[PDB]
Design a protein around this ligand. Structure first.
Ligand SMILES: COc1ccccc1[C@H](N)C(=O)N1CCC[C@H](C(N)=O)C1
Ligand SMILES: [Zn+2]
Length: 139
């Protein structure tokens, strides 16, 4: 679990969105596994606006933050899970690192701010849903 809180927005994995998220919906995209809802209080996270390929992510199944090198956002085939059939997920970046299903939502960040959140994993890989192209999150 986990979310990004920027301005009056809450960014979560679409597959983990709550009923309150759907009832206060701003935008959602199943192909990216992202959903954004509106919040009453203002958030403290800042979104990175860069092309960094190194950063640090939070792994809840280890209570640890790990530094990683990650690929550029791309269209990647993701195997069938209990939340989605086997499909191509877009705007996804891969890194070598530990992940388990409940790790989705953990933040990946670089020197400029938040880059994205954990969305996929398995076999010593972790995939992050990028949010750096969503310029409207800052307005
Ligand atoms: C962090 O997730 C994992 C980590 C290790 C092993 C396996 C997993 C998950 N079975 C996983 O990859 N997904 C399940 C949740 C939906 C994901 C998606 N965005 O399509 C795919
Ligand atoms: Zn950066």
């Amino acid at each position: 679990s986990g979310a990004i809180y920027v301005g009056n927005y809450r960014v979560v994995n679409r597959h983990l969105a709550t009923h309150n998220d759907w009832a206060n919906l701003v935008w959602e995209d199943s192909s990216r596994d992202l959903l954004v809802s509106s919040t009453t209080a203002q958030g403290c996270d800042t979104i990175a606006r860069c092309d960094c390929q190194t950063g640090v992510y939070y792994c809840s199944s280890r209570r640890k933050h790990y530094p990683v090198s990650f690929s550029k956002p791309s269209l990647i085939f993701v195997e069938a899970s209990e939340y989605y059939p086997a499909r191509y997920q877009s705007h996804l970046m891969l890194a070598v690192g530990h992940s388990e299903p409940g790790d989705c939502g953990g933040i990946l960040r670089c020197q400029h701010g938040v880059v994205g959140i954990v969305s996929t994993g398995g076999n010593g890989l972790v995939g992050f849903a990028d949010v750096r192209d969503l310029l409207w999150l800052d307005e």
